[PDB]
Amino acid sequence: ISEDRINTVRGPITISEAGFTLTHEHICGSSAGFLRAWPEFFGSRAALVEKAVRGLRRARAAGVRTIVDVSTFDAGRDVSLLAEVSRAADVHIVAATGLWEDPPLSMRLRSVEELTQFFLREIQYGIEDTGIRAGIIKVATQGKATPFQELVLRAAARASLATGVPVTTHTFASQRDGEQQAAIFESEGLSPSRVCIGHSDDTDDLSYLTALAARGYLIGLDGIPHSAIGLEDNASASALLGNRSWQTRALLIKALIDQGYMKQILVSNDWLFGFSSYVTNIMDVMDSVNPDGMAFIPLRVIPFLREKGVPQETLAGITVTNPARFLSPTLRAS
Amino acid sequence: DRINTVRGPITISEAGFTLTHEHICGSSAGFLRAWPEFFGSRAALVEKAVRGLRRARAAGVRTIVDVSTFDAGRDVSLLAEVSRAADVHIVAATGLWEDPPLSMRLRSVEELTQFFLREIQYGIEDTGIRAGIIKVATQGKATPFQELVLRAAARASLATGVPVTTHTFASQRDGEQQAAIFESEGLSPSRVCIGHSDDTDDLSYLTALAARGYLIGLDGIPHSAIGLEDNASASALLGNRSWQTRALLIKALIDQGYMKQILVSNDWLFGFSSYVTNIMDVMDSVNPDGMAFIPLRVIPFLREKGVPQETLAGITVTNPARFLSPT
Ligand SMILES: C[C@H](CCC(=O)O)C(=O)O
Ligand SMILES: C[C@H](CCC(=O)O)C(=O)O
Ligand SMILES: [Zn+2]
Ligand SMILES: [Zn+2]
Ligand SMILES: [Zn+2]
Ligand SMILES: [Zn+2]
């Protein structure tokens, strides 16, 4: 019959309003303060807003209703930008706290207790002076965790336990980062069902993925359209996007389904509409690869899996119900 | 004719007593806006900075140069608020310091030049406040990116006439490599201040640079961990040389004929998030005078050593005016 609230950049929404949800996206992958200090890098702020609003309208027309922007502070998350484009496009956006790959000195020097207070601040009080409350915590490793990355993982688990909001991660999938991340989260008493091990489609190792899924972890197959096939002459695009086909990444979805782990899958594009933390031309290159942007999951991956025999009701469970269970906050500890 | 401040243009004569290397708040890009509770509160930091700038003004300071860059967390709206409430001019900086984010580290020399020019000619962020100085940094031998920054800083200075000021590892003689790269871009040494030079006692390093026309920034005079020997983190940052030892370098350079190329400052700050958590309280406990330390302590110390008042006015008033006035 019933087919609690999630915080978005426009306020609370019910779990039913979330609908088709892309769990790992970015409006703009940047650096803290950068969009405000140098909007001309993106053409203009107004150009970036219009480009993002068109992109979100394209995804909405394909059925997307919510995206989770997993841009942290140090990824240059600007929640006022997310709020504006969410209003104009009528697509819900969940904002993130946490820390990504590029913390500044003022973060890198902090204690696990201090990082915990920062993450709690952005969840419980709001981000900057906007009142917008984060609905997920993003963390990152790139191989074995640095000492600071450990602190971030522990502060994230402690913030998650105190607030009920879930944790999503960036991995070097080929290095099986998810195993160490899981070990640290579990040492903090975090439930695996509140953790998504992200960028897991970057690897073909199914024994690694199914082992985490069997432990209750969510498996983020979140970069399906990332591929430099056809751009072999472009070293920067090839290093970023990899030489594995979108079809190859997509078949991991079906492989997890066939092995019984449908309930552990999350799917996304890991797209963006501006991109300043890499080489200068990279957004233009990615847009030439995938004009559909965030609409790639519903317009290309769903019809692909449907013809391989995956039932629509299974795909709806992965893209609607699974994110809903992920993002719905659990009870606060104590 | 005019110098750009966070309140707008001023004439050269309005600058008066000027501290050439200071910080309202040493932080990181976006950090003050995202986590102001680190400093108690934004209002508390404002209040602390206004009280400190008002004391410096009562001691005779009329202008400070805030050499906080984008990546040092410069918030020009904070600078504008505290300058207005303390009636002390503040000159804002562009350039890049020792903590550039990916979106900066990945940029070309041409792109960096455009960014520095924007903050000088157009304004910082959406405030309309234009930078009046370019800040650069090395910590020993320059990284490849730091070489780009020095070159972009030189090109921006040439296009606008605003001067360049540097962070050095003085005991590795960084000013020499900085001078080499600047001169390879055609930049005039008289447009360059080699900063943190009071961090070394090697006077021959300093005088060779000055004999080439450079300005020498003796800018951390009150930095000292004397009495804090059981504090490893303060000792590493502040050093174990006394403020008297740093101040004697001012007299030494005067005695060697370089009084017209000395720039003096405190390198102080009212908030400090880019180091260990307690560091601002520790620094305040050893120098409560803050930015008023130069006029309240260093001026009387030098006058007792026999430096005449006209020499001290030339260093604190005439030199900064000549340096900041765009060419
Ligand atoms: C598009 C994505 C944004 C950053 C991230 O997901 O780590 C990428 O660069 O891989
Ligand atoms: C006090 C000074 C502020 C930053 C700078 O001058 O490099 C420091 O942290 O060394
Ligand atoms: Zn990532
Ligand atoms: Zn991402
Ligand atoms: Zn410095
Ligand atoms: Zn400084």
Numbering used by the authors:
A (entry chain B): 26 to 28, 35 to 365
B (entry chain A): 35 to 361
What does the paper say about this structure?
The enzyme phospho­triesterase (PTE) is capable of hydrolyzing such OP compounds. Accordingly, it has been characterized from a number of bacterial sources, including Brevundimonas diminuta (Bd; formerly Pseudomonas diminuta), Flavobacterium spp. and Agrobacterium radiobacter. The present study focuses on Bd_PTE, a dimeric metallohydrolase that has a (β/α)8 TIM-barrel fold with two Zn2+ ions embedded in the active site. Carbon dioxide reacts with the side chain of Lys169 to form a carbamate functional group within the active site, which serves as a bridging ligand to the α-Zn2+ and β-Zn2+ ions, both of which are required for full catalytic activity. The buried α-Zn2+ ion is ligated to the protein via direct interactions with His55, His57 and Asp301, and the exposed β-Zn2+ ion interacts with His201 and His230.
